[PDB]
Swiss-Prot record, chains A, B, C, D, E, F:
Natural source organism: Helicobacter pylori (strain ATCC 700392 / 26695)
Catalytic activity: diphosphate + H2O = 2 phosphate + H(+)
Gene3D superfamilies: Inorganic pyrophosphatase
Cofactor or coenzyme needed: Mg(2+)
Xref: InterPro entries: Pyrophosphatase, Pyrophosphatase_sf
GO annotation, biological process: phosphate-containing compound metabolic process
EC number from the UniProt entry: 3.6.1.1
Subunit description: Homohexamer.
Family as reported in the entry's similarity comment: Belongs to the PPase family.
Protein name (record): Inorganic pyrophosphatase
Length: 172, 172, 172, 172, 172, 172
């Protein structure tokens, strides 16, 4: 694709998110800005698999040299490489070997899939949900040499929203 | 099915193993001796999935009130409920909330699938392989309340063989 | 002594390690660069004692503001303050209240003590050996207020080697 | 020796205690009633060592099928096998894998060693003292398969005294 | 009073329960069968207080030499000494220094107080409720010398019902 | 109220203490500096209640970002929000999830209530008294998720005094 010519939406409730990892995939792909090609970045060393679609937000820069990463919780898996509009429902803050790499939590626009419209904010997520996600991120790199992750916890939409604009200006 | 009328093989290189979990399945089934029906025992609380087919050996009793559990490493997934002939290549010893529940390591008879005939003993497994399996077992129950697991390590076929007979007499 | 005028060896199989804690000692000494004097850093609050000689590598800087710490497994205890040539056989990765402080695993040069020449790499260590050390590190600070330790696990020589050079350049 | 022909003292302030583990020893010996020979019972799996002399009281039966165990806090280590007169200053209650195995807390008769005469009752023990002992018991068997310990806490002399007579009648 | 001339009801849903401790009281009274007078049995050594009315069931004998103890969860406190008709909703099983002393869980007859009619069985109790009660019993005697309590957990009405008849026949 | 215009006394034997929790109350209130209003901070999850009036010392800063907390043992309960002059008789040191939060032990000026004038220092408190308070603090948060407390023990007036000035300069 061509991120350059892609209408980007930065509305908390209409967020343009490029997917890189489809839910349940243990293969971590990674789009390369120039080619626009998916780069197989790494296979999960352990017997695990992403708890939800994972991607990143176009035209944003956060404390990690890369745009702010994001999750789009849903019952389906969006083909790695596809694009989807989501809404910020919260965010999972954590630090790892590089430093602070927060992870915005989100769902697709109801227009796309109203299955979980009711989840208006982070507290609207089952406990189990939050646990599996947290535990995942704090264990999906145990077997990776020279690589760790310390998961702080989740936060509400407002916080996320903040994290958002924060990285947005940090972009240009 | 009817475990009662099933020819059981206890030859280390011809071991009759009833499967209960097909590779990659995050659903832990569990056959009930009387009904002969698969009982959904539990779904992985975490974003994980078995690293290889898991089942148990017929007519054997080990330190856990259940027949000795077993893994049948293979590139394919055997339909939960099916039966397969394997051969002991080792065993992963560990203890959990209940106590000592060793897990035999095995592959299907070459006649069935010669893909990995060359793996004559535990040392013939890729490091990664052993790591993924070990790590799995020592984290697949983190989120389960009142439930832990301490994985000791692996052992050679000989050790396994022992564990086997040990539980075999312990049966009748 | 005078670390400044000490021939340092950074060959994985000829590593110059300054000892600070002799095996079995519950007294954690700590050399001070300027004075070159052993500083009693702290006495084990618990009823324990180091599983092997503990020291550090001269002229190296790791993620802890201090040179990469190291262990020199042997049957004898080297006088705290002495220097010894070891060889990297692995490394124990872990994180604590400060962050990531890996611990190189090593033995003295066979020329010095050929007792355990055969241990060419981490896997050549008795399970028990690895357990006592791991457990030790993950419990030797329970009683210490505002201080914790999360032991990840061990790794092979190669990994260690890497960890080494990594901190070596990080030095100058 | 011959426990049978040994004048036993059951006075709280003149208690006959047979030692089986000298302070700092990581070797847990265990006298056999008939032979009267020290039986090496087990070596500490971890990098620890007893915080004080450990023994048991002759001709007493507690809830563990064995005479009530006891500690004899002192600055020295009494040769495993030796006998010593102590006085009850308290007791450390706890339960483990078998059940309830309380541990009397005591010191030798001042006549023998007046170093700590002032410690008339449990409260007279430094905090650190009590912590190290408690911690010890609740971690000296972590690495032991199928074996745990839950340490409740300590109690005053009166309590201990009770525990004593209780197991004393429970003897004959 | 005169337990002897008191119409006793042993219907699971019309259980005659003599109160000895009113909810929130830290004073444990204890009726004496002959005098029919409340015996102050003991004051809570700790800064606690009963989570609900406590008493016992007339003309019943359980494994403790005393009638089966019982709780009558309600928003009010019944004057120690008074009698009340409850209904078994479950039971909290536990063991202590003496042995097995189960504690029936119950509420008063709706006719008396319909506030919690809807709680038809143990599961109908708020988590918090069950926690505070469990925790209470497993900590209300920490400071009591030579006295402990191991709380197993709760069970459904059916279980309780059983425990009931069990101790009822065990009476005469 | 208005802490700002309140004559504060920092004399060990004339200590100005703002009460926030009246003895026996299970409701932990918490004055807010600006509003001067009692903030209901939290209700005891367990079946407990404070062993004595709890409050804090005005214009003081300790290692917890809050003024140094304090207890005013007395037979009566002072209306949460009221102010009272006490005298340091000791202090209970302890650490929790946050860190070191010592708790000054004190009584009201004899002029106010001479009932316990005789208690000149920590040793003058009944054992029971000290046990119930210690045990309380080390169990009043068991049921609280992500929250623990490690009670070291008590100390004499002198110690307390120290702790006082310490936090006093730490204020301005």
């Amino acid at each position: 694709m061509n991120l350059e010519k892609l209408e980007v939406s930065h509305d908390a409730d209409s967020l343009c998110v490029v997917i890189e990892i489809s839910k349940h995939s243990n293969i971590k792909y990674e789009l390369d800005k120039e080619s626009g090609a998916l780069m197989v970045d790494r296979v999960l060393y352990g017997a695990q698999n992403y708890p939800a679609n994972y991607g990143f937000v176009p035209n944003t820069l956060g404390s990690d040299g890369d745009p702010v990463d994001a999750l789009v919780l849903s019952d389906v898996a969006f083909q790695a490489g596809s694009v989807v509009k989501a809404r910020l429902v919260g965010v999972l803050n954590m630090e790892d070997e590089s430093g602070m790499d927060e992870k915005l939590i989100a769902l697709p626009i109801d227009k796309i899939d109203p299955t979980h419209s009711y989840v208006k904010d982070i507290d609207d997520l089952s406990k189990h949900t939050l646990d599996k996600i947290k535990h995942f991120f704090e264990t999906y790199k145990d077997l990776e040499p020279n690589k760790w992750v310390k998961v702080k916890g989740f936060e509400n939409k407002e916080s996320a929203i903040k994290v958002l604009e924060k990285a947005i200006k940090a972009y240009q």
